[PDB]
Amino acid sequence: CVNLRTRTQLPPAYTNSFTRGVYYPDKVFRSSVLHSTQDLFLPFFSNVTWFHAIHVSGTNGTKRFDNPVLPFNDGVYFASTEKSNIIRGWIFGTTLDSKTQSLLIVNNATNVVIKVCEFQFCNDPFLDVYYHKNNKSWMESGVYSSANNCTFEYVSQPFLMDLEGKQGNFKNLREFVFKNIDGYFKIYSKHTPINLVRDLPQGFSALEPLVDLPIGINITRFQTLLALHRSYLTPGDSSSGWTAGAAAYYVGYLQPRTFLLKYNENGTITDAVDCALDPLSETKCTLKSFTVEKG
Amino acid sequence: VVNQNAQALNTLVKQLSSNFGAISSVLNDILSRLDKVEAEVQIDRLITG
Amino acid sequence: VVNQNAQALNTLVKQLSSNFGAISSVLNDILSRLDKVEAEVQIDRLITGRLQSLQTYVTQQLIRAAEIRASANLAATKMSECVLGQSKRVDFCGKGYH
Amino acid sequence: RVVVLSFELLHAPATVCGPKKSTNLVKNKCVNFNFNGLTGTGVLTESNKKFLPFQQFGRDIADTTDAVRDPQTLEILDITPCSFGGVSVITPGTNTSNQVAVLYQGVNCTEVSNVFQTRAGCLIGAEHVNNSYECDIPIGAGICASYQTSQSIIAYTMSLGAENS
Amino acid sequence: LQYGSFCTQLNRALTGIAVEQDKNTQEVFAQVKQIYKTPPIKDFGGFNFSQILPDPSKPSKRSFIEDLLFNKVFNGLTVLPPLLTDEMIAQYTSALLAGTITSGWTFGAGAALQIPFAMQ
Amino acid sequence: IYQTSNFRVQPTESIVRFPNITNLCPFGEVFNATRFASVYAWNRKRISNCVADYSVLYNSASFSTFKCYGVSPTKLNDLCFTNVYADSFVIRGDEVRQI
């Protein structure tokens, strides 16, 4: 396990969700139509909590890793704005200790691995990342000290992933929705290319269903898994101890909501209305239309 | 105007011959066959229709 | 007139996905799930609600057709009195002296 | 000892099904079908609808199925209802003749001894004529029928009146 | 079938509405026994009717103002066609215009008697 | 012109399509499991991605209750489900009516 001897926690910052966190509600194709649906959604223009992982170099070199335990409630919108693959996965459960079954989700850099077990998680859970100089390759370790009484496991098809630390603006936006309903843990996702110094982008985007897991466990809390590099973010430096590349993530809770969804000819969701937002949005849902006439 | 009103009354009179999901169209036959508690369950379907 | 005929037919169509207290709105669910005796009690609930929907549609259409007949009678009278004649009836054929 | 078997029906495609076996797939014919327990009757056609990879079924504005994915080959089929229409019988009336013509309203003549595709439907048993007359019996879409000379039922586009300059 | 006559009753009602739509159109537009042509010389005293008369270059004899007006506006359910086509309604409407501009009100009561348009 | 009836194009044949899966569902690991739960801790098994021959269960002479609520027991082989949960426990015979 990793043992960080120093950590500075910042208070929860906030940013606006705009029109984000919409996902395809069901496995049904629909085309050139407006459709009204009730589900857990991220409310439009709600405040999403903001968290960061950063290393600041200097004579008082400051290392920051926001990975608190957070409430899950009925479900979570999660987004990350990143330069490098620093966010690696999540833990979900109730006690987050060996007394109860917890879901582990982890991108190891070859496969997504999913497990449900009575985990003895590390006192601070992180992915320990290091460069093996003889094999000329990255390696990953260190989420838990033991696992017992496992009730589910899955492993994705293989892929390759870059773990080198990149400078400049945030280049990647990753968006996820997590839900725990009827005994099914449902995941939705999307990836978007961006070029931003900070915050979520304005504009509309719909997350596709990624997977649907029949795990049955009671989830009330979760935690993000961050990569910690044992060494440099790029070759040829001379620093010491752990580091993390610059990453930001955003957390928004889902609520029971009515939405009106616009589907184009190609059956992509191109726009939406949160019917509970304001009296104009309720008027758009009342008329089942994105345009309201004089009246 | 004569034919429409004659046709509406014929349709109304023919609707008395419908069961509406009761065991019979005939109200006295239900009341002759069944005791009160079970008869009224049939009468309610004739009333509704 | 176009919008009301569409809105009334759309309401008639979307009443087919109402349960009316049956186990499903889909008539083939009942008949693929249930036997002779179990099915018919569910069929009678759909029949009753669909029949109620259809009686409601035909009654709105009769009332709406009487408005269109009154409008067409006025149009036919303006065809005789305004196009086939010169009317002296004030404001029957526009404003000013016709 | 008690076992409660509790079920969830179709929302996603089914994963538990009874011990039945699939038939081969036929297209451009009116058939009954059953895909994963989703029963129906209709004409099956190869779809051009762009289902996303997770999507199983497709629906019209009415919230009714109009496309499906086959469980065995993951291609998309458009579902069209097998055709229907009013049948109406056209006659000069029994005191004149026992001749009749028949209209299959809104039906194409390929779906059904004279045969004639009006816009009102496929008309059968009426002689189409190039002349125009007063409307005797209305059919719709400018067509009328009459009984005329050696007698036959004729179908024609109606004239509106004598042309005058 | 336990419900008796209710479907036949509902279909009789909808059939009666459908027959009335043809009657309504016939009582409005079929107000002339003759299809009046407007003369090939449009010498109507300086009054210009080209936007309300037909243009024969169109695939139907709608007027220009009628072309504007026409641009502005499976579950056992069917739409039946009207008896008269929009082309036939335009032919009746064209005859009513030609009658009025060539003969004033006279075609409304008897034969169309020509009168000069300024004289009318 | 008199509307005398309706026309219908009737179906010529019936299609069946199901997935190319062949493994039976593990009902033996429920009905022939060694020991059952106490009812307060009633034991749930989710069953998925398999062929459920319910005619095996319904033709077993041993069951003193076999009682379906939203389906008829003869129709179960004709039918399909997203998921099934088999919930197992022991109770007193006079209390079986409460399930």
UniProtKB/Swiss-Prot annotation, chain A:
Residue ranges of the region described as Putative superantigen: 264-285
Impact noted for substituting residue 107 to Q: Partial loss of biliverdin affinity
Annotated consequence of substituting residue 140 to K: In strain: Kappa/B.1.617.1
Phenotype when changing residue 6 to N: In strain: Gamma/P.1
Superkingdom classification of source: Viruses
Effect of residue 218 to Q: Increased resistance to neutralizing antibodies
Consequence the record notes for mutating residue 12 to S: In strain: Gamma/P.1
Impact noted for substituting residue 167 to E: In strain: Omicron/XBB.1.5, Omicron/EG.5.1
Disulfide bonds listed in the record: 1-122, 117-150, 275-285
Glycosylation sites: 3, 47, 60, 108, 135, 149, 218, 266
BetaCoV S1-NTD domain boundaries: 1-287
Substitution effect: residue 194 to V: In strain: Omicron/BA.2.75
Effect of residue 174 to S: In strain: Gamma/P.1
Annotated consequence of substituting residue 237 to N: In strain: Lambda/C.37
Region (Disordered) residue spans: 53-66, 128-148, 157-169, 230-246
Task performed by this protein: Attaches the virion to the cell membrane by interacting with host receptor, initiating the infection. The major receptor is host ACE2. When S2/S2' has been cleaved, binding to the receptor triggers direct fusion at the cell membrane. When S2/S2' has not been cleaved, binding to the receptor results in internalization of the virus by endocytosis using host TFRC and GRM2 and leading to fusion of the virion membrane with the host endosomal membrane. Alternatively, may use NRP1/NRP2 and integrin as entry receptors.
Quaternary assembly: Binds to host ACE2. RBD also interacts with the N-linked glycan on 'Asn-90' of ACE2. Cleavage of S generates a polybasic C-terminal sequence on S1 that binds to host Neuropilin-1 (NRP1) and Neuropilin-2 (NRP2) receptors. Interacts with host integrin alpha-5/beta-1 (ITGA5:ITGB1) and with ACE2 in complex with integrin alpha-5/beta-1 (ITGA5:ITGB1). May interact via cytoplasmic c-terminus with M protein. May interact (via N-terminus) with host bilirubin and biliverdin, thereby preventing antibody binding to the SARS-CoV-2 spike NTD via an allosteric mechanism.
Listed name of the protein: Spike protein S1
Native source species: Severe acute respiratory syndrome coronavirus 2
Residues of the full protein shown: 15 to 311 of 1273
Curated annotation (Swiss-Prot), chain B:
Effect of residue 32 to A: In strain: Alpha/B.1.1.7
Coiled coil: 1-43
Function: Subunit of the fusion protein that is processed upon entry into the host cell. Mediates fusion of the virion and cellular membranes by functioning as a class I viral fusion protein. Contains a viral fusion peptide that is unmasked after S2 cleavage. This cleavage can occur at the cell membrane by host TMPRSS2 or during endocytosis by host CSTL. In either case, this triggers an extensive and irreversible conformational change that leads to fusion of the viral envelope with the cellular cytoplasmic membrane, releasing viral genomic RNA into the host cell cytoplasm.
Official protein name in the record: Spike protein S2'
Species the sequence originates in: Severe acute respiratory syndrome coronavirus 2 (2019-nCoV)
Lineage, uppermost ranks: Viruses, Riboviria, Orthornavirae, Pisuviricota, Pisoniviricetes
Entire-sequence positions represented here: 951 to 999 of 1273
Curated annotation (Swiss-Prot), chain D:
Disulfide bonds: 30-82, 109-122, 135-144
Annotated stretches, region: Disordered: 11-33
Glycosylation positions in this chain: 95, 108, 130, 149
Consequence the record notes for mutating residue 126 to V: In strain: 19B/501Y
Subunit structure: Binds to host ACE2. RBD also interacts with the N-linked glycan on 'Asn-90' of ACE2. Cleavage of S generates a polybasic C-terminal sequence on S1 that binds to host Neuropilin-1 (NRP1) and Neuropilin-2 (NRP2) receptors. Interacts with host integrin alpha-5/beta-1 (ITGA5:ITGB1) and with ACE2 in complex with integrin alpha-5/beta-1 (ITGA5:ITGB1). May interact via cytoplasmic c-terminus with M protein. May interact (via N-terminus) with host bilirubin and biliverdin, thereby preventing antibody binding to the SARS-CoV-2 spike NTD via an allosteric mechanism.
Described purpose of this protein according to its UniProt entry: Attaches the virion to the cell membrane by interacting with host receptor, initiating the infection. The major receptor is host ACE2. When S2/S2' has been cleaved, binding to the receptor triggers direct fusion at the cell membrane. When S2/S2' has not been cleaved, binding to the receptor results in internalization of the virus by endocytosis using host TFRC and GRM2 and leading to fusion of the virion membrane with the host endosomal membrane. Alternatively, may use NRP1/NRP2 and integrin as entry receptors.
Full protein name: Spike protein S1
Gene: S
Coverage span on the entire protein: 509 to 704 of 1273
